[PDB]
Structure formats: C-alpha cells, structure tokens
Design a protein around this ligand. Structure first.
Ligand SMILES: CC(=O)c1ccc[n+]([C@@H]2O[C@H](COP(=O)([O-])OP(=O)(O)OC[C@H]3O[C@@H](n4cnc5c(N)ncnc54)[C@H](O)[C@@H]3O)[C@@H](O)[C@H]2O)c1
Ligand SMILES: CC(=O)c1ccc[n+]([C@@H]2O[C@H](COP(=O)([O-])OP(=O)(O)OC[C@H]3O[C@@H](n4cnc5c(N)ncnc54)[C@H](O)[C@@H]3O)[C@@H](O)[C@H]2O)c1
Ligand SMILES: CC(=O)c1ccc[n+]([C@@H]2O[C@H](COP(=O)([O-])OP(=O)(O)OC[C@H]3O[C@@H](n4cnc5c(N)ncnc54)[C@H](O)[C@@H]3O)[C@@H](O)[C@H]2O)c1
Ligand SMILES: CC(=O)c1ccc[n+]([C@@H]2O[C@H](COP(=O)([O-])OP(=O)(O)OC[C@H]3O[C@@H](n4cnc5c(N)ncnc54)[C@H](O)[C@@H]3O)[C@@H](O)[C@H]2O)c1
Ligand SMILES: O=C([O-])C(=O)[O-]
Ligand SMILES: O=C([O-])C(=O)[O-]
Ligand SMILES: O=C([O-])C(=O)[O-]
Ligand SMILES: O=C([O-])C(=O)[O-]
Lengths: 326, 328, 326, 328
C-alpha cells in the first residue's frame, strides 16, 4: 500500500575497489539500498549483481543497482560516498607514490560530482574518500553547496585504526579498547597523537612505566602509522588499500544514518579552530543525524603543534594549487 | 561421523532474572549451548523451552536445556556463570536495601557451588555475579580450587557501564566512545574514577574547559553511578537489575570464549597489585582465552587512593568475617 | 544543527515481562529509541534505567525511557507494540489456564490504547500481543481507526517458531532451515500445517520416506506445538512465555522498519480470504515498509479446512462476546 | 598463563579476490584468525595489513597474517578454503568463457595443495572453490586423503543464492524467505529446481495460479541463474564474481565451526545417492561440527532426472580425463 518506512539509500559515486566494498558492507548488514555509479560501463552492473546475490546468501534484503546517469544515481540519496578518481599517477614507480600528485587528475572529477549533487540531492550527507583527501573535500564543498556540517572526508578514522591495531598488538589487547587518534592532513604530514593514547581510558604512560611497551616502540608505531598507506601500495603492486577504507567510510555513514553520535576523527570544516577558516582538515568529530555536530580542538604539545602546522601548510598549499587550476 | 567442532557450553548456575537473560543473549547470538540450573524445579524448564523457541525466531542453532543435578549442569561447561542466591533480604524496606546484608544467605550457596565445580568442571572459567560480589568471588575461589586466573566477578563492567551512559548523555555522544571506569568493591564504596574519564581517549578535562560539562555535573554523575543499583531496586519494587548485569557477564564470557583480550574491569585475584594479596576486588583487567591474562594497576592520586582504601577495608573486613564464621 | 536522520522510535505500551524484553532487543541491536509505558509507576523507570545501562555495555546508542502519559509515550512512535494486560485469570488454577478467559479483563485496556493511538500517532504501525490475541487485534482495529494494512497481531510467528524448533530437533538441522507454519487462531484451535513443512524448500514427505522422522512423530510435534504456551505457563508457575514472544514481535517490527518484506505469519485483517471478512486471524503475510503488504491464502486439504474452521469459530465467538461487553 | 580457549583458524589458500574477501568476512565478524597464502609475493602481506586494520575500525580482534610456506599457512587450520587457481584462460574472449577450460590449468595446483593438507592439517574441513568445481573437489579429496565427510565444494549455495534473489525480486519478498535450490555440477548443466521453489514453505505453483508470476517468468529465472557466472564475467571485464562466492564459502565454514547443521547445497561425496559412487556433485546436505553430516536425496521427475543425468555425465567424463592425465 502506502510506503511508510523507506530504506535508507547510499549512492557510491565511483564503483572501484572501495565503492564495491562499501556496497558489500551495506548488503551484508542490510544498512541501506545501494546505487553503484562509475564512468566505466559494465563493471558496475557486474558488481551490483554479485552484491544482490550476497543478500540471498546472508539472508538480508536491500536493493543493489548500477546507474550510469548522475540523476538516477544521486536522486533520493541519504548519503553520497565519493571514491571516483585515480589512486596512482600513471607511469610513476611505487616508490614515488604520492597522494598529492593525484590533485591534477581528481580535482575536476570531484568538482563535477559536487555540481551534480547540488542539482540532484542538495540535502544529502556527503562523505569524500578521493585523494588528496582534505583538498578534495573543500573542492566538493564549494561545488556541492551543501551546509558545511553536511560534508566530511574519510581519512583519519583509517589512520587511527592503523595506529590502534599496532598499539593493540604491542599491548596484546583488543583494538576495541585502544583509543589512539591521528589528526591533520591525510598524508606524510599526518599527526599521530602518541600522547593521547589510552587503553580503555587508562593513560598509555602507565603502560610504559610498567614496561609493557617502550617509548621508542610507540614512536616507531607512530612512524609505521604515517607510512602504512604507502606500505600497502607497495605490497599490493596495483591500486591501494580498500578493506579498512571501506569499513571506515561506512562506519561514518552509519553514525550519520542511525544518529549514533560516534566520536570519529575525519576531515571537517574549520570554523576558527586553531585559527583555521574556510578549509577542511582532519580533526576528531561527532557524527550524528545532523551531520558533523562537534569538532574537538585538542590541546597540542610542542611537537604536535609543529607537526600539525606542517599538516596545515600541506593542505593550504594544495588548496592554493587547486585554485590555480580552476 | 565424529564431531570435530563442538559448540561452546555455558552453564547458568541459577536460572532467575539474570540467568535466564544471559541464556537469552547466548540464544540470540548463537554464542553457545546453554544449560539452566536452579534449586527451584519446573521454572528453568519453562525458560529453557521459551529460549529454545527463540533460536527458531532468530534463525540460530544452540541447544538450551534445563538440568537438575550439579553433575548434569556443570559437566563439560567451558564457562560457568553463577547467579544463584538472594537479591533482597526478606521483610526489609527497599530504602534499607544493602548488598552486604546478603552475606549470611549467599555464602553457603556460593561455597556449595564451588565444591561442585571442583568436582565436575575444574577446568572451567568461572564468572560470579551473586552479591555481595567481591566476597562471593573469594568464597567461590576457595571452594572451587580453580587457578586464580580462571575466576572473576562481574560488577565493575556494569558500574562502568552506568557511569558511561550518564557521561554519554551529558556529552551527547555514543557510550561506545566514553571510557569511564569504576574500581573497588561493588557497593557504596565503589570508586568512580572521574579524573580518568575519556571521550575516545580525549581527557574529560577538555570538555570541562570547553564548557560542555562541569566538575559538579561529573561528581553528581559519579554519585548516581554509586547509587544506581539501589535506585533500580526501589523503582522495580521486586528484585534488582538484570538486563545490563546479564549483558556484562556475557560480554566477559565472550571475551574469554573468543580470546578477544578485551580490557574489562572486574573483580580479580590480587597478588601484589595496589599492595593487595589473597583477595579479589574490582580492577581493570584483560580477559582472554587464558582467562584473566592481565591485572592493570592505575596510578591513583591521594584522594583516589583514599576512596579505594575504604573499598579495600570493606571487603577485607567482610572476608575475615566470612572466614571466621565458616563451617569446618 | 538541524536533525536530518532521526532514529526510529518504538513505544512499548505495557512494560511487563514482554515489553521489557522487546526494549532489551531494541537496545542490544541499536534498532530504535525506546519508550516504556505502563499503568504501574516506578517499575518502567527501573527497567528504562537498566536498559539504558545496556547500551553502554554493548556499545550502542539509543534512548530508552519511561513515560507515564499516553501523549508522551505515543507521540512520534513509528511502531507501537501493545502487551498491556493480564496473562492469567486471578485465582484460577494453572491447570485451567485459558487465553479466552482473559477477554473480560483485557478488552477495555486494548480499546483505550487504541483510542489514544488514534489521537497521538495515527500513522504508526500497531503490533498487538495482548491475549486473546486475534480478538484483541479486532478491538484495537475498531478503536484505533488506522489503515487495515497498518495493524496486526503477533502470535503465529511464535507458534511457528515452536513448530520449527521441534521439527529442527527431530531432523538434527538448524531451525533456520525449517519452514513450518501455524495459521488460525492463537489457541487450542491453532492449526500447525504439518503438510506444509519443508526443509530448505524440500518436502517433509521425503524425510519421512528416508526414515528421518515418522508421520506419527510429526503429528506429536503438531500437538506439542498447540500446547506449548500452557506447557510453559505450567513450568513457570507465574506468568507466561516472554523471550520468544518478544523476539517474534521485534522481528515483525524490524521487517516493517527496514522494509524487509519478510514472510511472517501473523494476525491480519481479512478482506475475503477463506470467506473471512471484517475480522483478524493468523495467516502468512508479507510485512514491509507499507505494513501488511500481502496476505497469503494457502490451499487447505480436508483435515486442514476442518481444523481451520474450528479456529475461525473460536475467534468469531470471541468477537461476538466482545461486542456484547462493549 | 595457559591458553584454554584458542580462536578458530581459517586458512585462505589463494589470496586473490575471493580469498581476500573471505578474510574480510572473518575480520568483520570476528569469526577466526586468518592466514592469507598465495604464490604471488607481497600481495598477501598488503591484504593482511589492510584486513588487520579493519579489526580496529569494526572493533573486533582476530589475527590476520600472510604466510608464504604451506606449513605456516596450513598448520593448526580448523578449516581450509581453497581458491588458488585461474579464473579465465588467457587470450580467450569473454564470450567464450567456460569453467571446464580451466581444468588443465588448475588440476595440478589443487592436487599439490591437497598433498600439503594431508601432511600439515589432516583433521581440517576442506572447502574447495576453484573451478571447475566438482572435478576439483574430487582431486582435492584424493590428494588430501581426508575423510569424505571432511571435504566439500562451494557452488550450489552461490547458484541457489542467485536463484533466490531473482525469485525474491519477482515476488517482492525477502530472499530469506525464498527456498530455491540448484543441484548438479556448477556449470551450464546445473539444475535450477523450479518445481521445488517455495516461499517460506509455500509452493511456487500457488503464486503462478494466483497470477503473481508466470511459467515463462520462472523459466527465465532458471535460465538467468545458469548464466549468472558468465554474465558477471562479461560485465566485469577482468576476473569473475567474488562477493557472493566469498559469503557462500564462509557461511559453509561457519556452519561447520559453530556446528549449526544448516542445510546447504554443496559439492559432496556420493555413496549411492541418485546411484552415484566415488565422485562429488552438488546436492543438498547438512553441514555441522562433523562436516557433511547428511546428504539429501530429492525425488526428481523425468525432466529433472534428464537434466541431472546430463550434469552427472559431464563431471564423470572430466573426472575420468583428469585421472588419465594426472602426474605420478
Ligand atoms: C583518504 C583515504 O584514507 C583513502 C584510502 C584509500 C584510497 N583513497 C582514495 O580513494 C579513491 C578510490 O580508491 P579505489 O576505489 O581503490 O580506486 P579504484 O579501484 O581505481 O576506483 C576508482 C573508481 O572511480 C572511477 N572513476 C574515475 N573517474 C570517475 C568519474 N568522473 N566519475 C565516477 N567514477 C569515476 C574509476 O573508473 C574507478 O572505478 C582513490 O582516489 C584513492 O587514492 C583514499
Ligand atoms: C555484581 C553485580 O553487578 C550484580 C547485579 C545484579 C544482581 N546481582 C546479584 O546476582 C544475584 C542474582 O540476581 P537475579 O538473577 O536477579 O536473582 P533471582 O531472580 O532471585 O534469581 C536467583 C536464582 O537463584 C536460585 N537459587 C537460590 N539458591 C540456589 C542454590 N543453592 N542453588 C542454585 N540456585 C539457587 C533462585 O531459586 C533463583 O532462581 C543476586 O545475588 C543479586 O544481588 C549482582
Ligand atoms: C499472542 C502470544 O503469543 C502471547 C505470548 C505471551 C504472552 N501474551 C500475552 O501478552 C500480554 C503480556 O504478557 P507479559 O508481558 O508477559 O505480562 P506481564 O508481565 O503481566 O505484563 C503485562 C503488563 O501490562 C501492564 N498493564 C495492565 N493494564 C495496563 C493498562 N491499562 N495500560 C498499560 N499497561 C497495563 C501490567 O501492569 C504489566 O506491566 C498478556 O496479555 C499475555 O497473555 C501473548
Ligand atoms: C564454484 C564457484 O561458485 C566459484 C565462483 C567464483 C569463482 N570460482 C573460482 O574460484 C577461483 C578463484 O577466483 P578469484 O579469487 O576471483 O581469482 P583470483 O583473484 O585470480 O585469485 C586466484 C589466486 O590464486 C593464486 N594462485 C595461483 N596458483 C596458486 C598456487 N599454486 N598456490 C596458491 N595460490 C595460487 C593466484 O596468484 C591468485 O592470487 C577461480 O578458479 C574461479 O573460477 C568458483
Ligand atoms: O590514502 C591511502 O591510499 C591510504 O592511506 O591507504
Ligand atoms: O548489585 C546490584 O544489584 C546492582 O548494582 O544492580
Ligand atoms: O499466548 C501464550 O501465552 C503463549 O502461547 O505463549
Ligand atoms: O563459477 C563462477 O565463476 C561463477 O559462477 O561465479
């Protein structure tokens, strides 16, 4: 009869490794109907079929469909997750992999998508994934026109998860009980907050005194955290990480769709925090039904401010660069 | 043919509110086969049937059944969760409800159960719930004879859980991201560690400075945390809390059965921590497939040590009384 | 700021054994905000506190609270599950337990709740649990005035669940893969459809031929199914079943809230099925975002028609008794 | 202290698309520790790292590691899922994609892995995924030497899942409530049992008579089911389906590890069923803690027997050829 409860709808703009994987999580958990969009014809339909098949195997019921027009993909989307763009510069060695070099390639793609979001789903919650992340979020914000609390970028939840897993291993505890955060720009200048590491809220410092972990060891973990993306790029040979990036993005989408109010670091709009304005950078935030509801301005020690400033310079330089392109 | 992968088995010794509720969680998550045991005959069989029906409704497959003998209930249990005993003293005003008053009624029961565990499943992991919790864990340890890392009491995860829900409501965040801990003995002398509260590892002091919450609010929250049990007893009229207590005990059991190594505060054996020996008390610990794999010692400050020390005296006095009064 | 994604809200009208258990399921699964209402004061606040504490323990975030006024409990409820009423007749012996005897006591309670639903949440989905079920849904229908596709009674999913568990045990397979259905009036006249039992879609007859189970065994299971509610009443001593009943009603509400379109037997409004009109009785149905989306009319053999007619007569007499009372 | 509850361990031999995806399910659901093994160097390590990262994101705790020796990968494996092998013959047009063409490229690989299992984890439950499925299960069985109930092939759950999705869409109901099964060999000769389709036990015939679906519609659904694999091969351009295959394999692995006794059609050893001996073919079976605990023989009508006989003839032919060409 009259539909009273409508399933949530998530449009995956870009159906590569991450888009498909996020679609998988949606089908596995029955979180929402899924739309797979991409410029590559055919592939999206193959994945949609494969995913629709998953719903039977795992006894869930959501609709997964491919769409090749912006209008069909975006109309009615409660949340739009963008992964469209390149992951590596063509004809460039894995050792020279740089997220920033992707800017000239993905800038125009993010812009076009945002103009379409503005046209077809101006009230949606946008989650950007495309690199260089913090820069692409701004481009997306300017082109989409959505309120600044309704757009963010997935980056720091992934970096923090990496940070968390390494600490968890060192301590021999579930990463569920390791709170470790990475803030700043998603890249070599990201800032792992070693000082803020807690084990179920217990200061990491005590674990150092009790000899469970050493200061040197934690510093090495922070370093491993910064280069984890490039490490996977090198091991994989082709493309980059997608399982954790997909899981992080969906976690954020979920906190939004279910108004959970999780505390998740991500690339958020700056309203004066740290003296920053009209830009996006990775900071701890609360994601709820009204989108980004809080942005935490942590007190930084000398070393952290130093690293964060460099993170800020990197971002502002990238945004200057995009402004020069168009 | 031969069974190669056997389901885990959790024996609920006591099939009242909490025992039946824990049985429900196992059924809902297909966590393990469940055995319901109680001195009251008839009732656990009714709950076993009800619970077996749940498996159909939620598409899971675990066996849920009642056993009336200790031998049939305990044999083969990977984990034994004890809730057997009284929640309230007969003919006593809810205004006067006290967990310590139960000491005379539950001691004997807990001791008998431990003697049976020693007899039927000495390799099991024991999770005690029966109040007064910290004293009972010790009685259970002595009677069962299991290694000290294979036994604990469920309490602080519940107390921290309450602490967390209140903080989460004051900050408008998911309790998943509030790490608030309560240590000490489960009672009026429990120690809500207000100074240690974090929001995804971020010091609470930052939310205080930001003007989102005040120290005053936090202290009122710790006070609520402490009287949360009695509050529910008074509201309910009969019995006490069971939904969160059951979820707490099962989360601990799951961390054991799956070797998750989650960091959950519970009543654990002390062998030097905080200067305590031969006793159990609420402390942050790591629960893994080897039982209590680690007992965390926090750097308490003067005021905290004073409150913890009061908690220590209460349980030591009671343990001495129990030993003094024990039958040969 | 502006809330865009709002959690679903389910009101439990009646906070005894079943209302509290359903609240438990909502909190454990982060299914929806919960409201506990009851005529008894204090108790609902006690359970609400206990349940809110659960969210922390299992890392979910939903609001659980007690409300004493109908206006507070019902306003905004996406779904209302009614368990308000008695489970046993005061003074009557357990051996003489009957759902039909509860009619004089619960009919007035249900009618009042219906009028309050009309007033505060006419657009909600109503799931009645209070016995005598099929009769009570009718009472709720007339008093509430909601669309005929927006009200139903929970009973047969529970009866079928019991039916499936017993069959599952006889065959040594997961109940997940046993399709067993009970239709008719929730009572001694309920009709377990032995002939329609399938194991992952495979006819039960083949298993009979393979000697996995005998026809006599199936018939005894059908009988056990019929008397399961009383068997539990007798074993419990006080009250009746609540774990499976609660799970059954939440499964129904979930199929509604997420528009799953599950095929769940329940008490639904008849528009001519079996020649039944202006009444409610248990039949297989499809529950989705638009409430009862389809009612399935199975072909019945001679014995089934015979047993079903008794089911119909049972409930028609009950509805007759109610019109005489109010 | 001593570990008492050890996590389950699943070894993905072959860490391509399906192998990696199954590891994801294990990490997402905290089902078991995972070992990613492959002959391609580096790639498994990249995926293991990425999957270990997932555990933090979704708050679970299982170990995910890459292993380059058969011994490290296989020792202690409760279950081994083999996806090692080719998906398409190089240089052949997608329009000419045929699973049987893979036989000469994957048979030796499957045999080797089997030889290593016999040595390193003879008590494991083996789930083969590599095509051509039914023929590879037999090679694995002979090479590995495990009891016939401890090995099966994943295929019909996938085929049946596609079958169920299409029917569910036609009826506008959840696939959870559609029981549709495909038996026979995983290929063009697979048998979608249209006549056995039920909606929560209710026969599809009634929906035809009531005008909800048509005979042609169901026929197109059976046909669409048979060609689904190739359909995705052609759409994707490179490789073949992996999301549903992975979920089907892990669902089977889970029924074994949790002794759920789910009724899942899969490639199982035949000892008389439908008159077949010494071979594997897709049939409904019960998967539990003792591996394949029952194989269901369905009554087939004339047309079904004709089609099933056709799939039987295909696999027996191949099994014969494989044996003739096997290396000493
Ligand atoms: C911030 C962070 O943590 C993180 C982590 C991992 C990857 N990424 C980035 O996320 C992006 C996606 O990675 P991936 O999924 O592995 O990549 P990949 O598998 O290559 O898929 C990108 C997809 O987008 C498609 N595409 C290209 N142009 C367009 C366009 N105009 N409109 C729609 N689709 C288009 C492309 O055809 C392909 O299907 C890359 O830019 C990565 O660098 C970010
Ligand atoms: C530590 C903590 O956080 C916490 C929280 C809530 C309740 N509790 C305590 O946990 C216990 C159980 O709570 P409940 O389930 O609500 O209580 P309740 O519902 O009364 O059930 C206790 C059950 O144990 C049974 N019993 C009594 N004596 C024996 C015996 N000798 N052997 C076997 N069974 C027996 C009794 O018949 C009843 O079915 C009480 O002692 C509570 O105070 C502790
Ligand atoms: C159909 C089916 O399968 C099934 C299964 C089990 C129980 N039931 C019935 O479901 C109902 C609830 O069972 P229960 O929860 O176990 O029972 P119980 O635990 O007694 O709770 C019923 C609750 O409703 C309350 N109540 C009474 N009158 C009102 C009123 N006017 N307004 C609001 N609340 C009121 C009462 O105070 C109590 O808290 C009974 O009628 C049972 O017979 C049906
Ligand atoms: C039965 C069924 O339903 C089904 C469905 C989909 C795919 N499959 C088959 O499953 C297999 C794997 O598919 P995929 O994962 O998508 O493919 P793909 O991603 O290409 O991975 C196969 C992996 O195995 C590796 N490999 C090759 N030889 C060996 C060896 N000797 N030892 C260890 N690893 C080796 C190879 O390097 C690659 O990483 C193929 O044979 C498919 O045809 C079966
Ligand atoms: O951005 C990336 O590619 C990463 O960190 O995985
Ligand atoms: O011990 C108790 O009863 C409590 O805290 O709920
Ligand atoms: O209605 C009942 O009481 C039952 O069947 O459980
Ligand atoms: O076997 C296959 O590749 C399939 O059917 O997906």
């Amino acid at each position: 009869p009259a539909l009273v409860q409508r399933r949530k709808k998530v449009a995956m703009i870009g159906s590569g490794m991450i888009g498909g994987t996020m679609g998988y999580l949606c089908a596995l958990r029955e979180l929402a109907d899924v739309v797979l969009y991409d410029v590559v014809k055919g592939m999206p339909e193959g994945k949609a079929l494969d995913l629709s098949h998953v719903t039977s195997v795992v006894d869930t019921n959501v609709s997964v469909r491919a769409e090749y027009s912006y209008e069909a993909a975006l109309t009615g989307a409660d949340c739009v997750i963008v992964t469209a763009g390149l992951t590596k510069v063509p004809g460039k060695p894995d050792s020279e992999w740089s997220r920033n070099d992707l800017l000239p390639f993905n800038s125009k793609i993010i812009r076009e998508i945002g103009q379409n979001i503005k046209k077809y789903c101006p009230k949606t919650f946008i989650i950007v994934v495309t690199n260089p992340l913090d820069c692409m979020v701004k481009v997306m914000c300017e082109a989409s026109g959505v309120p600044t609390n309704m757009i963010c970028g997935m980056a720091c939840m992934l970096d923090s998860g990496r940070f968390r897993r390494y600490v968890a291993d060192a301590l021999s505890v579930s990463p569920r009980d390791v709170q470790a955060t990475v803030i700043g720009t998603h890249g070599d200048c990201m800032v792992p907050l070693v000082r803020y590491i807690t084990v179920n809220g217990y200061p990491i410092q005590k674990f150092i005194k009790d000899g469970v972990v050493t200061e040197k060891q934690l510093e090495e973990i922070a370093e491993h955290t910064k280069v984890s993306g490039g490490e996977i790029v090198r091991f994989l040979g082709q493309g980059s990480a997608y399982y954790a990036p997909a899981a992080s993005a969906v976690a954020m989408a979920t906190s939004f769709l279910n108004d959970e109010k999780r505390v998740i670091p991500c690339s958020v709009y700056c309203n004066g925090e740290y003296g920053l304005k009209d830009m996006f950078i990775g900071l701890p935030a609360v994601i709820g039904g009204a989108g980004i509801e809080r942005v935490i301005e942590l007190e930084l020690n000398e070393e952290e401010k130093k690293q964060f400033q460099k993170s800020v310079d990197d971002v502002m330089a990238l945004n200057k660069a995009v402004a020069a392109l168009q």
